[PDB]
Amino acid sequence: SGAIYVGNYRVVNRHLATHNDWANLVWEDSSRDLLVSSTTAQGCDTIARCDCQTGVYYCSSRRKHYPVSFSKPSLIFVEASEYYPARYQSHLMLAVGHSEPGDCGGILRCQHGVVGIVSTGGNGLVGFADVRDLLWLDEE
Ligand SMILES: NC(=O)[C@H]1CCCN(C(=O)c2[nH]ncc2Br)C1
Ligand SMILES: [Zn+2]
């Protein structure tokens, strides 16, 4: 589990969105595993606007932050899971690291701010849903 709280937005994994998220929906994209809902309180996270390929992510199954090198956001074939069939997930970045299904929502960050959230894992891989292209998270 886990969310990004930027301005009056909550960014979660689409597959973990709550009823309250769907009832307060701003934007969702199944291809990216992303959903954004509106919040009453202002959040403290800042979004990175950069092409960093190194950063640090939170792994709930280890209670640990790990430094990683990650790929540029891409279209990646992701194996069928409890939440999606075998498909191409877009805007996904891959690194070597531990990721169990419940690690989804952990933040990946760089020197500039939040880069994305854990979206995929297994086999000693971890995939991150990028949010750096979502410039509207910074206004309105
Ligand atoms: N966005 C997706 O399609 C995800 C959904 C959860 C499962 N997915 C994984 O890769 C995964 N496997 N083991 C741990 C993890 Br995390 C695929
Ligand atoms: Zn950066």
PDB file of C-alpha atoms and ligand atoms in Angstrom:
ATOM      1  CA  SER A   1       0.000   0.000   0.000  1.00  0.00           C
ATOM      2  CA  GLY A   2       0.994   3.689  -0.248  1.00  0.00           C
ATOM      3  CA  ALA A   3       0.133   6.991  -1.959  1.00  0.00           C
ATOM      4  CA  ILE A   4       1.747  10.232  -3.174  1.00  0.00           C
ATOM      5  CA  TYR A   5       0.083  13.317  -1.520  1.00  0.00           C
ATOM      6  CA  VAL A   6       0.827  16.340  -3.769  1.00  0.00           C
ATOM      7  CA  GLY A   7      -1.350  19.497  -3.553  1.00  0.00           C
ATOM      8  CA  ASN A   8      -5.025  18.373  -3.275  1.00  0.00           C
ATOM      9  CA  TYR A   9      -4.272  15.055  -5.059  1.00  0.00           C
ATOM     10  CA  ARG A  10      -3.788  11.437  -3.858  1.00  0.00           C
ATOM     11  CA  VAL A  11      -1.896   9.213  -6.361  1.00  0.00           C
ATOM     12  CA  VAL A  12      -2.428   5.445  -5.809  1.00  0.00           C
ATOM     13  CA  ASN A  13      -2.124   2.188  -7.713  1.00  0.00           C
ATOM     14  CA  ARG A  14      -5.395   1.888  -9.707  1.00  0.00           C
ATOM     15  CA  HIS A  15      -5.680  -1.756  -8.541  1.00  0.00           C
ATOM     16  CA  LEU A  16      -5.580  -0.624  -4.830  1.00  0.00           C
ATOM     17  CA  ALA A  17      -7.981   2.399  -5.200  1.00  0.00           C
ATOM     18  CA  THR A  18     -10.738   2.593  -2.496  1.00  0.00           C
ATOM     19  CA  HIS A  19     -14.455   3.390  -2.992  1.00  0.00           C
ATOM     20  CA  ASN A  20     -13.695   6.917  -1.663  1.00  0.00           C
ATOM     21  CA  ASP A  21     -10.961   7.253  -4.371  1.00  0.00           C
ATOM     22  CA  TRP A  22     -13.475   6.247  -7.158  1.00  0.00           C
ATOM     23  CA  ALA A  23     -16.146   8.618  -5.656  1.00  0.00           C
ATOM     24  CA  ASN A  24     -13.629  11.542  -5.738  1.00  0.00           C
ATOM     25  CA  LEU A  25     -11.922  10.632  -9.030  1.00  0.00           C
ATOM     26  CA  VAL A  26      -9.657  13.088 -10.942  1.00  0.00           C
ATOM     27  CA  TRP A  27      -8.010  10.699 -13.509  1.00  0.00           C
ATOM     28  CA  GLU A  28      -7.351   6.982 -13.981  1.00  0.00           C
ATOM     29  CA  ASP A  29      -5.348   4.945 -16.534  1.00  0.00           C
ATOM     30  CA  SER A  30      -5.474   1.099 -16.435  1.00  0.00           C
ATOM     31  CA  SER A  31      -2.519   0.857 -18.936  1.00  0.00           C
ATOM     32  CA  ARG A  32      -0.321   2.718 -16.331  1.00  0.00           C
ATOM     33  CA  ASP A  33      -1.897   1.195 -13.116  1.00  0.00           C
ATOM     34  CA  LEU A  34      -2.507   4.783 -11.891  1.00  0.00           C
ATOM     35  CA  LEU A  35      -5.475   6.529 -10.238  1.00  0.00           C
ATOM     36  CA  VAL A  36      -5.665  10.072  -8.817  1.00  0.00           C
ATOM     37  CA  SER A  37      -8.379  11.298  -6.388  1.00  0.00           C
ATOM     38  CA  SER A  38      -9.057  14.698  -4.759  1.00  0.00           C
ATOM     39  CA  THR A  39      -8.158  15.421  -1.073  1.00  0.00           C
ATOM     40  CA  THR A  40      -9.530  18.015   1.393  1.00  0.00           C
ATOM     41  CA  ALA A  41      -6.050  18.471   3.029  1.00  0.00           C
ATOM     42  CA  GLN A  42      -2.923  19.678   1.109  1.00  0.00           C
ATOM     43  CA  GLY A  43      -0.095  17.085   0.842  1.00  0.00           C
ATOM     44  CA  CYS A  44       3.687  17.480   1.440  1.00  0.00           C
ATOM     45  CA  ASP A  45       5.151  15.439  -1.445  1.00  0.00           C
ATOM     46  CA  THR A  46       6.822  17.251  -4.400  1.00  0.00           C
ATOM     47  CA  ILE A  47       7.039  15.660  -7.893  1.00  0.00           C
ATOM     48  CA  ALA A  48      10.424  15.318  -9.633  1.00  0.00           C
ATOM     49  CA  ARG A  49      10.683  16.958 -13.097  1.00  0.00           C
ATOM     50  CA  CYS A  50      13.867  15.280 -14.474  1.00  0.00           C
ATOM     51  CA  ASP A  51      15.353  12.226 -16.338  1.00  0.00           C
ATOM     52  CA  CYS A  52      17.145  10.710 -13.273  1.00  0.00           C
ATOM     53  CA  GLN A  53      17.746   6.939 -13.669  1.00  0.00           C
ATOM     54  CA  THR A  54      19.034   6.576 -10.029  1.00  0.00           C
ATOM     55  CA  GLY A  55      17.030   7.001  -6.823  1.00  0.00           C
ATOM     56  CA  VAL A  56      15.720   5.259  -3.693  1.00  0.00           C
ATOM     57  CA  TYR A  57      12.504   3.281  -3.165  1.00  0.00           C
ATOM     58  CA  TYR A  58      10.545   2.105  -0.072  1.00  0.00           C
ATOM     59  CA  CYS A  59      10.057  -1.707   0.267  1.00  0.00           C
ATOM     60  CA  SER A  60       7.329  -2.468   2.894  1.00  0.00           C
ATOM     61  CA  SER A  61       8.223  -6.247   2.878  1.00  0.00           C
ATOM     62  CA  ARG A  62      11.743  -5.296   4.190  1.00  0.00           C
ATOM     63  CA  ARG A  63      10.950  -2.014   6.107  1.00  0.00           C
ATOM     64  CA  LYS A  64      13.880  -0.641   4.088  1.00  0.00           C
ATOM     65  CA  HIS A  65      14.682   2.081   1.552  1.00  0.00           C
ATOM     66  CA  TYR A  66      16.954   0.726  -1.247  1.00  0.00           C
ATOM     67  CA  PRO A  67      19.101   2.709  -3.709  1.00  0.00           C
ATOM     68  CA  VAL A  68      18.401   1.566  -7.299  1.00  0.00           C
ATOM     69  CA  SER A  69      19.274   2.199 -10.945  1.00  0.00           C
ATOM     70  CA  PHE A  70      16.079   2.091 -13.068  1.00  0.00           C
ATOM     71  CA  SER A  71      15.190   2.054 -16.774  1.00  0.00           C
ATOM     72  CA  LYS A  72      13.488   4.964 -18.585  1.00  0.00           C
ATOM     73  CA  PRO A  73       9.677   4.752 -18.647  1.00  0.00           C
ATOM     74  CA  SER A  74       8.724   2.143 -21.277  1.00  0.00           C
ATOM     75  CA  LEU A  75       6.038  -0.245 -22.543  1.00  0.00           C
ATOM     76  CA  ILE A  76       6.825  -3.540 -20.664  1.00  0.00           C
ATOM     77  CA  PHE A  77       5.038  -6.934 -20.938  1.00  0.00           C
ATOM     78  CA  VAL A  78       3.892  -7.700 -17.336  1.00  0.00           C
ATOM     79  CA  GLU A  79       2.852 -11.301 -16.389  1.00  0.00           C
ATOM     80  CA  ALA A  80      -0.817 -11.991 -15.446  1.00  0.00           C
ATOM     81  CA  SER A  81      -1.560 -11.283 -11.715  1.00  0.00           C
ATOM     82  CA  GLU A  82      -4.560 -11.204  -9.285  1.00  0.00           C
ATOM     83  CA  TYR A  83      -5.279  -7.635 -10.649  1.00  0.00           C
ATOM     84  CA  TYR A  84      -4.418  -7.662 -14.443  1.00  0.00           C
ATOM     85  CA  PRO A  85      -4.017 -10.217 -17.273  1.00  0.00           C
ATOM     86  CA  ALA A  86      -0.659 -10.636 -19.119  1.00  0.00           C
ATOM     87  CA  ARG A  87      -0.386  -7.251 -20.913  1.00  0.00           C
ATOM     88  CA  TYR A  88       1.790  -4.247 -21.880  1.00  0.00           C
ATOM     89  CA  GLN A  89       1.958  -1.744 -18.991  1.00  0.00           C
ATOM     90  CA  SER A  90       3.003   1.739 -20.181  1.00  0.00           C
ATOM     91  CA  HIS A  91       5.213   4.368 -18.453  1.00  0.00           C
ATOM     92  CA  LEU A  92       6.851   1.533 -16.386  1.00  0.00           C
ATOM     93  CA  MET A  93      10.508   1.634 -15.143  1.00  0.00           C
ATOM     94  CA  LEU A  94      12.360  -1.554 -14.052  1.00  0.00           C
ATOM     95  CA  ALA A  95      15.071  -2.065 -11.420  1.00  0.00           C
ATOM     96  CA  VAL A  96      16.649  -4.969  -9.561  1.00  0.00           C
ATOM     97  CA  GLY A  97      15.076  -5.211  -6.107  1.00  0.00           C
ATOM     98  CA  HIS A  98      12.586  -7.003  -3.848  1.00  0.00           C
ATOM     99  CA  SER A  99       8.818  -6.381  -4.549  1.00  0.00           C
ATOM    100  CA  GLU A 100       5.916  -8.519  -3.130  1.00  0.00           C
ATOM    101  CA  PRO A 101       2.329  -7.655  -4.231  1.00  0.00           C
ATOM    102  CA  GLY A 102       1.725  -5.628  -0.991  1.00  0.00           C
ATOM    103  CA  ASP A 103       4.831  -3.431  -1.701  1.00  0.00           C
ATOM    104  CA  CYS A 104       2.769  -1.620  -4.411  1.00  0.00           C
ATOM    105  CA  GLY A 105       2.457   2.108  -3.448  1.00  0.00           C
ATOM    106  CA  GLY A 106       5.969   2.522  -2.017  1.00  0.00           C
ATOM    107  CA  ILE A 107       7.594   5.760  -3.294  1.00  0.00           C
ATOM    108  CA  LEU A 108      10.572   5.915  -5.630  1.00  0.00           C
ATOM    109  CA  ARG A 109      12.366   9.301  -5.282  1.00  0.00           C
ATOM    110  CA  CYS A 110      15.433  11.148  -6.565  1.00  0.00           C
ATOM    111  CA  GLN A 111      17.322  14.363  -5.611  1.00  0.00           C
ATOM    112  CA  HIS A 112      14.432  16.374  -7.252  1.00  0.00           C
ATOM    113  CA  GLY A 113      11.458  14.677  -5.526  1.00  0.00           C
ATOM    114  CA  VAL A 114       8.938  11.824  -6.087  1.00  0.00           C
ATOM    115  CA  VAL A 115       9.502   9.852  -9.349  1.00  0.00           C
ATOM    116  CA  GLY A 116       6.774   7.191  -9.076  1.00  0.00           C
ATOM    117  CA  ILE A 117       5.317   4.286  -7.058  1.00  0.00           C
ATOM    118  CA  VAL A 118       5.918   0.538  -6.941  1.00  0.00           C
ATOM    119  CA  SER A 119       3.575  -1.136  -9.533  1.00  0.00           C
ATOM    120  CA  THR A 120       5.273  -4.595 -10.329  1.00  0.00           C
ATOM    121  CA  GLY A 121       7.791  -7.130  -8.854  1.00  0.00           C
ATOM    122  CA  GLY A 122       9.101 -10.719  -8.413  1.00  0.00           C
ATOM    123  CA  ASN A 123      12.216 -12.551  -9.705  1.00  0.00           C
ATOM    124  CA  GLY A 124      14.372  -9.885  -7.944  1.00  0.00           C
ATOM    125  CA  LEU A 125      12.766  -7.175 -10.194  1.00  0.00           C
ATOM    126  CA  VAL A 126      10.754  -4.095  -9.122  1.00  0.00           C
ATOM    127  CA  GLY A 127       8.727  -1.954 -11.574  1.00  0.00           C
ATOM    128  CA  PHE A 128       7.732   1.672 -10.905  1.00  0.00           C
ATOM    129  CA  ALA A 129       4.768   3.578 -12.428  1.00  0.00           C
ATOM    130  CA  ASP A 130       6.329   6.924 -13.501  1.00  0.00           C
ATOM    131  CA  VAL A 131       4.489  10.190 -12.626  1.00  0.00           C
ATOM    132  CA  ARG A 132       7.114  12.747 -13.831  1.00  0.00           C
ATOM    133  CA  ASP A 133       5.194  13.469 -17.109  1.00  0.00           C
ATOM    134  CA  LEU A 134       1.937  14.329 -15.165  1.00  0.00           C
ATOM    135  CA  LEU A 135       2.622  18.110 -15.020  1.00  0.00           C
ATOM    136  CA  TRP A 136      -0.976  18.862 -13.917  1.00  0.00           C
ATOM    137  CA  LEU A 137      -0.214  17.280 -10.482  1.00  0.00           C
ATOM    138  CA  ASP A 138       1.594  20.628  -9.708  1.00  0.00           C
ATOM    139  CA  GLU A 139      -1.492  22.952 -10.215  1.00  0.00           C
ATOM    140  CA  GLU A 140      -5.306  23.417  -9.754  1.00  0.00           C
TER     141      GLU A 140
HETATM  142  N1  LIG B   1       0.755  -3.513 -12.140  1.00  0.00           N
HETATM  143  C1  LIG B   1       0.675  -4.833 -12.297  1.00  0.00           C
HETATM  144  O1  LIG B   1       0.264  -5.361 -13.334  1.00  0.00           O
HETATM  145  C2  LIG B   1       1.148  -5.676 -11.124  1.00  0.00           C
HETATM  146  C3  LIG B   1      -0.001  -6.030 -10.167  1.00  0.00           C
HETATM  147  C4  LIG B   1       0.552  -6.718  -8.917  1.00  0.00           C
HETATM  148  C5  LIG B   1       1.408  -7.921  -9.288  1.00  0.00           C
HETATM  149  N2  LIG B   1       2.425  -7.589 -10.301  1.00  0.00           N
HETATM  150  C6  LIG B   1       3.733  -7.842 -10.163  1.00  0.00           C
HETATM  151  O2  LIG B   1       4.537  -7.651 -11.068  1.00  0.00           O
HETATM  152  C7  LIG B   1       4.243  -8.458  -8.887  1.00  0.00           C
HETATM  153  N3  LIG B   1       4.519  -9.780  -8.807  1.00  0.00           N
HETATM  154  N4  LIG B   1       4.980 -10.150  -7.568  1.00  0.00           N
HETATM  155  C8  LIG B   1       4.998  -9.041  -6.839  1.00  0.00           C
HETATM  156  C9  LIG B   1       4.557  -7.921  -7.600  1.00  0.00           C
HETATM  157 BR1  LIG B   1       4.503  -6.138  -6.983  1.00  0.00          BR
HETATM  158  C10 LIG B   1       1.838  -6.986 -11.501  1.00  0.00           C
HETATM  159 ZN    ZN B   2      15.648  13.590 -10.463  1.00  0.00          ZN
END
